[PDB]
Design an enzyme around this catalytic site. Structure first.
Site, PDB file in Angstrom:
ATOM      1  N   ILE A 199       0.824  -1.114  -0.041  1.00  0.00           N
ATOM      2  CA  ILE A 199      -0.093  -0.103  -0.064  1.00  0.00           C
ATOM      3  C   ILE A 199       1.041   1.192  -0.007  1.00  0.00           C
ATOM      4  CG2 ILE A 199      -2.095  -1.230   0.835  1.00  0.00           C
ATOM      5  CD1 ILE A 199      -0.155  -1.680   3.033  1.00  0.00           C
TER       6      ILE A 199
ATOM      7  N   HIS B 128     -20.454  -0.356  15.406  1.00  0.00           N
ATOM      8  CA  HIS B 128     -21.354  -1.603  15.722  1.00  0.00           C
ATOM      9  C   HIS B 128     -22.505  -1.261  16.966  1.00  0.00           C
ATOM     10  CE1 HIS B 128     -18.636  -3.533  13.573  1.00  0.00           C
ATOM     11  NE2 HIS B 128     -18.317  -4.469  14.193  1.00  0.00           N
TER      12      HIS B 128
HETATM   13  N1  LIG Z   1     -12.142 -10.063  13.476  1.00  0.00           N
HETATM   14  C1  LIG Z   1     -11.371  -8.864  12.953  1.00  0.00           C
HETATM   15  O1  LIG Z   1     -10.267  -9.038  12.664  1.00  0.00           O
HETATM   16  C2  LIG Z   1     -12.029  -7.465  12.966  1.00  0.00           C
HETATM   17  C3  LIG Z   1     -13.355  -7.028  13.363  1.00  0.00           C
HETATM   18  C4  LIG Z   1     -13.762  -6.225  13.381  1.00  0.00           C
HETATM   19  C5  LIG Z   1     -13.141  -5.195  12.619  1.00  0.00           C
HETATM   20  N2  LIG Z   1     -11.934  -5.332  11.972  1.00  0.00           N
HETATM   21  C6  LIG Z   1     -11.093  -4.214  11.724  1.00  0.00           C
HETATM   22  O2  LIG Z   1     -11.049  -4.658  10.175  1.00  0.00           O
HETATM   23  C7  LIG Z   1      -9.606  -4.690   9.719  1.00  0.00           C
HETATM   24  C8  LIG Z   1      -9.273  -6.158  10.120  1.00  0.00           C
HETATM   25  O3  LIG Z   1      -7.722  -6.364  10.031  1.00  0.00           O
HETATM   26  P1  LIG Z   1      -6.949  -7.624  10.502  1.00  0.00           P
HETATM   27  O4  LIG Z   1      -7.673  -8.635  10.091  1.00  0.00           O
HETATM   28  O5  LIG Z   1      -5.509  -7.349  10.267  1.00  0.00           O
HETATM   29  O6  LIG Z   1      -7.190  -7.304  12.218  1.00  0.00           O
HETATM   30  C9  LIG Z   1      -8.892  -3.555  10.990  1.00  0.00           C
HETATM   31  O7  LIG Z   1      -9.164  -2.361  10.350  1.00  0.00           O
HETATM   32  C10 LIG Z   1      -9.883  -4.168  11.999  1.00  0.00           C
HETATM   33  O8  LIG Z   1      -9.682  -3.381  13.251  1.00  0.00           O
HETATM   34  C11 LIG Z   1     -11.267  -6.559  12.246  1.00  0.00           C
END
Ligand SMILES: NC(=O)c1ccc[n+]([C@@H]2O[C@H](COP(=O)(O)O)[C@@H](O)[C@H]2O)c1
Ligand SMILES: NC(=O)c1ccc[n+]([C@@H]2O[C@H](COP(=O)(O)O)[C@@H](O)[C@H]2O)c1
Lengths: 479, 463, 479, 482
Positions: free
Chosen positions: C87, C228
């Site tokens: 990125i 949420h």
């Molecule tokens: N289960 C999850 O990984 C989850 C849940 C909710 C939000 N997010 C967000 O979406 C993105 C996910 O990135 P990662 O899978 O590297 O955690 C980030 O912006 C994160 O904070 C992730």
């Protein structure tokens, strides 16, 4: 966000002398204007800035209330009066207005007092001047559209240069103090809102009635008709104010945002619906005011398919109002000049009284916006075994004789200078109002509906009195 | 026919009832504590006839008729032989009833077709009303009994049920929710003249709250009947009084305040204190105030603020329903008190109905944009300049003529009144509570002013 | 209306492209919802061609076993691509039919999002033909969020943007409005009169393990409450849309968002609580603390708790208790509308608990709507007869065994290939969400509130149970 | 103390009462000293007819309650003397049978109202009457209001109203008892319990059986006199009653009597519109072919076995809310239940979408099971192209499942214990009875002048086609599971 540089376009117009310059001096003479205020009045005709000021003084003398008039307070207001002869068609003329204008950071309030065709040319010249740039507002009080398409035509071409926040479309109604207390009465009191629903409310109705005719505006009135002229904005505003859900707080847009919604949610009137729900009425030769008056064709002198009268049983289709008929009625050459609102409530769930005893009369609240302002609520009281539906009456004019009878523009004018103003219409309100109104004309224009006339002063077409009464209700009439 | 007005030769029947009776026109028999002549009873009536409506007395040939036809008769109320010196009203008191009722019936006979109107508190303790009622019901018919509440017959008291139940707007808020508190106020500018000793034993509480107001409370707080039947009305009032929160020996200390009218001014003249007028020490409460609570699904938690007094600064009768305020002020702090909507009806002093409303003030986009409280008036006694402001008692006699109690107090009603009342008494007497002197023409003890204010509420003053 | 055959994936390396998005897509193609003709870019650079192997590793262990099949996987594996790019570098982004619409999904971080726009515009991918979706945690502050939103808006039209919140796709979250406005019993009670407080709880047993490093940035309140749980508040409080329209429903949420009582720097000490998961037991097993798991000492909240207030007509004075948590006793998201108690107990206190009625929507893991009623116990008692509270239970999981749809994401995703967007957030919604939350963080920073430790698995800081206790309210748990 | 069962030979006594008494003895709620004297019109004259009662225990009483050892403790409290209500002279045998006055006597007349007066005359000669003596009666309480009054007037003339304990079998069943707890022990319902928020009410007692051994008593009255004047009419009062201030006997009643006084008169004119009558007809029941009612009667029959009414309470709360009553014999199933349809949602936010949005409904099944549930609309789970699906759903409460532990006992045991207790809480008042009677007497007259004919339905069928149309014209239907 107060603006210290303002430009008055169309200053040659009757409205500017009749409703604008007097409102301004009324604000001046009492001191609501930052004395560092420029007012660059612009007209096609040629006058010296000192000259134009002399013309304004005539208008102030011929229109401003005498008690307000003061030769000192006029003079102090004229030394803030600056003019500049300019053609719109020529954008090169505007720069002279620009040199007069105060610095842009102080900002410019741009009033448009012309014709919507003339609008398009004027906006272009301002950008070369630099007045088009942000920190400039813009008010409009014209036949700025008859259908959606024009209004969209006029608006779409404006929103190209400014934004909704810059635009300040104005409705003469809402200037009215009476129009304004309506939100206060509904939301400053907790009794109305419990019953302000489809339950305990039966029918509601609007009647803006006038004896006067289209004297002088005829030929130009023939283009709008009562429905384009009064109900499109003026009356639909009454509906919005009376049916709108409360905003969380007294915000320009949040208030608007609820009225916008009421405009959005209404029963559409379709082709089949119109014959049942719409009534037209032109004016027969009649005697009004105790003096005989000529028919509409008499004065018009030409074939005419315009109304002068309209009456529509509208429906607000929201949880709160679904199924509550809203009976509109406006028209000219009527028995009285009396604009009024009657909320009629659903009757008591059970009459625990003898059949012989006076039939109960449903509680109703009546507000007359004009000319007198009064609020009354119907009740039932046992008589000193019978009763009389008697009224709990109140006159606002009696309540505040001392308060000045300011002009409806003095108030509207300042909101525009002060900051975002809720008394000014938005595009979202404007498009919705046409949505309902337009179809109505197309559907009944497509239906070869031609207005049924009445003799002037007859209370309007007989066909009307039955629209309401074929549902079982009568139009409020004094006795 | 022929009646008997035992105590018609009295104040009860010289202005309130008998002077009003002039309109109620049969031979009229009237007993008399001051036993005067046949013509003299008419002559005494004629002076009371002089104290009547000017037009109605002047128009009537009755004043000439009263001289033409009159009855007077040593009451001899105490004597078993109290009679012979059809329907008789006991303008007497509770004491001037028991022996009076026993003997008056015996000489001319009694049984049905005889009147039986208490025209009195007709009881001090429950046992008084109890015992005295019990001996009557065992000797009369329940239909024959007509316990009388001077108020209930007052036309203004009457339209309430029409007001309340002929109108959709009032009921949705008439709840525990949508009402902050109710307020009843019986005021008189007068002191007590010649009645202080009878009043002193009774107390202000017993004289007005037990009979004049409790009904008013029922009329204001009662759930509706299915239909406007005599018993249907009464059955729902009984429901009110029996739902009154009892004032314990603990509830009296915080929820009541006693008073007593002192020396001062009334209008353009000055009057003396109460006990000094009595000439004997009095612990009677000229003025009492109650924080009554009615507990029911509809009202539990709605305070009922009572207030009746003597030598009060002004005499007014009215009810202040103050409604629970708007759930949210959709406006800024700068503009508007947003004072709560209230419904006020003046009753005995004048007939009017007014509702508090808040209206935006005429305004410009100035820094402050206040909205002021405004009221919707109706002058119940000004719109009906055709209807005669006829006395309240006059009409009740018509119901007696009907023989149907359209508005007379019922024993099951009455017995509910004492049980609560007497619990204040037995209780606060068990706490050694004593009356508080207040200046003639002021508003009782200042101990009251704090009773209303410890809740965040104030009494109602037009100014 | 998409005309879209092209998908763009960013951040695949994350524990999100694997746990939720990859299985979600598995459903979209295994039941004919994905075109046969129908990219993987990594926030952390990865060796390529790994994904066809990776999906089998990641999917098999994530997707439902009954759903899993050998065939469906091959078509999905084929469609999938994998380019290893950074990125940070725009040139890398450039390394896809024009006619097919390009829909750009950004599963990275908010900071990485700007770069993706930077390469897209220059690589040839951003196009009116391109629609971009954005993750829920975008921005840490309104100004930072406004920064990124403003940049995307110049690059992309709002319609092309599809602002993502996964909660809005959860089925129990979706029918909330149907529950509320398809049923008349609930609305009369849903007012300051008839509701004592609302109670929301998203509960989690699992602390961040891999994500603690990125989490430490966004507090549990930022990660969940901003998007949420704050949406839940809208659905549980929003005034009814006249008709369900994606924008009007969003519009009415915005109104709810804007009517929350400001949590300033003075209302934070009294109306909020922070927590950090200490060390304890998770599943009969010992698990470590935040600071142990993440070495850097941190004040970050793994737990939050709010007492929010909606101050409109309907809700003025109804407390709203929000409790997102990590390492909590259970995974139970649950709204519990508790209603005002009976206005009067016409029943003796000795036999009556007379507990208030409570609407409990269990959103996860089980779908279970229920209402609580108090009913007399069956016994013969002369006096003080006992009354027992009882629950009317429902099971959207048991009633809809036939419907059988596994996940919220596949609907939301497919919707982007459809271009519907009703689920996706609106900018005006987003910014009113931040301003409220930003104040709560600033006030604690200005007021130096530091998270209290709670042994892992104990509902949270002792301070929460007392925030409810002072008001008499408790935290509903199965008893 | 001492109990008497006038009417001892009754089938109802055999199944409803003798089993109930055994349960009180088994639970030891019955005094050992107390002795029960039973007089039966036609059978089991011998005191050792206990075996006949024991026969009754077997065919009716639950096995778990039944305990061979526990029977004998109870049957040796049973003393039978053959007696004839018509002849007072033999009332004495019931006296001289335990019954010490100081212990006091509880008298039960399982006899019909016509036999009621005669039994009382024997007791006064027996010294049974007046002090230390109670009196219980039964559901019919006279053919008509004057007929009930004439029997009534003499009861209060003989025993003080404190001592008359009239029995309405329904009031005392646990499911009937909770109603008021439902209404006023919760805040959710009453906002909507009005003429705004409600479409209609529905009370329905259904029965799979016909009349067997009850026919001779039954053909005198009819279903409305049988299970409506007392039973279903009590339920109506409880459903529509304005709450009491606090839960006292007369406080409850005084509003119930009003609900009865509130009800609008069917009159002669409304019967064509508001009344539907049926005659039980030969068909199937229980999966069995059962005989037609007239054929069973052995004589022409004008009595309904089925009725269906559109009742109206004309008060503030309920004015204009139809109450659809429907009590039947040989109906497809046995199930008493109430269905409040709440007035439908005021406007639909999702009007364009396909789903019906059916009106909410509070369902309470008093019998045979005990159950409360609630109709709510909830969105159907789906992935939607354009347009949406909504499915109505039910919030369940099985009271029996919630409290299975607590013993399930006959309503009569609660009704009977109060008698020995001297408690009038589930016992009807004369004012209660007259209000129910006047309404019933007026519909009966309206039927008489219009010569309405019970319309024959098959056995095991949902009554006559006449009833379905009366519900259909409003738009309302009858709740039928599935
Ligand atoms: N289960 C999850 O990984 C989850 C849940 C909710 C939000 N997010 C967000 O979406 C993105 C996910 O990135 P990662 O899978 O590297 O955690 C980030 O912006 C994160 O904070 C992730
Ligand atoms: N199941 C029943 O037999 C039943 C139910 C309700 C009332 N009753 C009354 O009790 C008596 C019953 O006597 P039988 O057992 O001979 O039917 C009658 O007075 C009858 O009205 C009987």
């Amino acid at each position: 966000n107060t603006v210290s540089t303002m430009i008055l376009f169309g200053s040659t117009g009757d409205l500017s002398q009749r409703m604008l310059l007097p409102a301004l001096y009324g604000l001046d003479a009492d001191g609501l204007l930052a004395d560092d205020l420029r007012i660059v009045c612009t007209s096609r005709s040629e006058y010296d800035t000192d000259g134009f000021r002399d013309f304004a003084e005539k208008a102030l003398d011929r229109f401003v209330a005498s008690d307000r008039l003061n030769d000192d307070a006029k003079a102090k207001f004229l030394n803030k009066l600056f003019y500049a002869t300019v053609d719109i068609t020529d954008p090169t003329q505007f720069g002279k207005i620009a040199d007069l204008c105060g610095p842009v950071e102080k900002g410019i309030a741009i009033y448009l007092a012309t014709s919507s065709s003339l609008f398009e040319g004027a906006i272009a010249g301002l950008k070369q001047a630099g007045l088009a740039g942000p920190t400039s507002r813009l008010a409009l009080e014209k036949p700025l559209g008859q259908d959606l398409a024009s209004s969209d035509h006029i608006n779409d071409a404006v929103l190209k240069v400014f934004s909704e926040k810059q635009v300040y479309r104005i409705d003469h109604y809402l200037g009215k103090e009476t129009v304004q207390n309506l939100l206060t009465l509904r939301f400053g009191n907790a009794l109305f809102e419990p019953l302000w629903n489809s339950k305990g409310i039966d029918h509601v109705q609007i009647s803006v009635a006038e004896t006067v005719g289209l004297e002088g505006r005829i030929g130009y009135f023939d283009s709008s008709g009562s429905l384009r002229d009064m109900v499109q904005s003026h009356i639909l505003q009454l509906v919005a104010l009376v049916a709108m859900e409360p905003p969380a707080h007294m915000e320009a847009n949040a208030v608007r945002d609820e009225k916008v919604k009421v405009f959005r949610a209404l029963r559409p009137i379709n082709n089949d619906t119109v014959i049942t729900h719409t009534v037209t009425g032109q004016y027969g030769a009649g005697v009004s005011g105790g003096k005989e008056v000529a028919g509409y064709i008499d004065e018009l002198g030409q074939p005419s398919d315009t109304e002068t009268f309209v009456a529509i049983k509208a429906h607000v289709d929201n949880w709160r109002w679904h199924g509550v008929p809203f009976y509109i009625r406006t028209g000219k050459r009527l028995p009285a000049r009396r604009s009024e609102i009657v909320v009629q409530f659903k009757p008591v769930p059970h009459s625990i009284f003898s059949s012989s005893g006076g039939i109960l009369q449903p509680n109703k609240l009546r507000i007359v916006l004009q000319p007198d302002e009064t609020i009354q609520i119907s009740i039932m009281v046992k008589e000193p075994a019978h009763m009389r539906e008697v009224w709990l009456d109140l006159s606002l004019t009696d309540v505040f004789k001392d308060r000045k009878r300011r002009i409806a523009h003095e108030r509207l004018l300042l909101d525009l200078i002060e900051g975002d103003a809720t008394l000014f219409v938005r595009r979202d309100e404007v498009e919705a109002q046409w949505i309902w109104i337009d179809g109505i004309r197309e559907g009944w224009k497509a239906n070869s509906m031609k207005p049924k006339t009445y003799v002037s002063g007859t209370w309007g077409p007989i066909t009307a009195i039955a629209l309401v009464e074929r549902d079982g209700v009568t139009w409020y009439d004094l006795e």
